[PDB]
Amino acid sequence: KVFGRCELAAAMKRHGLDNYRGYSLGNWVCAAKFESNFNTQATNRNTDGSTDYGILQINSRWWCNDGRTPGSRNLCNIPCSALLSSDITASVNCAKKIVSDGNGMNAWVAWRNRCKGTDVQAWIRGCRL
Ligand SMILES: [Cl-]
Ligand SMILES: [Cl-]
Ligand SMILES: [Cl-]
Ligand SMILES: [Cl-]
Ligand code: NA
Ligand code: NA
């Protein structure tokens, strides 16, 4: 499915992402906009054999198992296919592990390039959560 901005903000807040590991809710909403365009089914292949999956474009080299990526670590202990569900639970649970790895939200390339340093509160503005 394709989330609306405030719809995703609400869902992400219900799933405990607001201020998680020091990152306010707008960071997560912005990340999702630029990672997947709010589409839970977005996938993108990479040069190293990996693929990024779902609303938060979680990578199969480190985080989820897709059975076709070399050097896979499956640190979220989740099949990548589960991260393409319209329900964001598996993606959020994995994201929480990723952001806890010791480099914050920098693992999200689109967040790093297009969200970090901007006023991310704007992403939840008007949502009255
Ligand atoms: Cl925010
Ligand atoms: Cl898979
Ligand atoms: Cl959901
Ligand atoms: Cl899960
Ligand atoms: Na929670
Ligand atoms: Na980018």
Swiss-Prot record:
Keywords: Allergen, Antimicrobial, Bacteriolytic enzyme, Disulfide bond, Glycosidase, Hydrolase, Secreted, Signal. One of its GO terms (biological process) is defense response to Gram-positive bacterium. PROSITE patterns: GLYCOSYL_HYDROL_F22_1 (PS00128), GLYCOSYL_HYDROL_F22_2 (PS51348). Residues 1-129 form the C-type lysozyme domain. InterPro entries: Glyco_hydro_22, Glyco_hydro_22_CS, Glyco_hydro_22_lys, Lysozyme-like_dom_sf. GO terms for molecular function: beta-N-acetylglucosaminidase activity; identical protein binding; lysozyme activity. In the egg white and polymorphonuclear leukocytes. The keyword Disulfide bond applies. Pfam families: Lys. Substrate binds at D101. It is found in: Secreted. Lysozymes have primarily a bacteriolytic function; those in tissues and body fluids are associated with the monocyte-macrophage system and enhance the activity of immunoagents. Has bacteriolytic activity against M.luteus. Lysozyme C is capable of both hydrolysis and transglycosylation; it also shows a slight esterase activity. It acts rapidly on both peptide-substituted and unsubstituted peptidoglycan, and slowly on chitin oligosaccharides. Monomer. This is Lysozyme C.
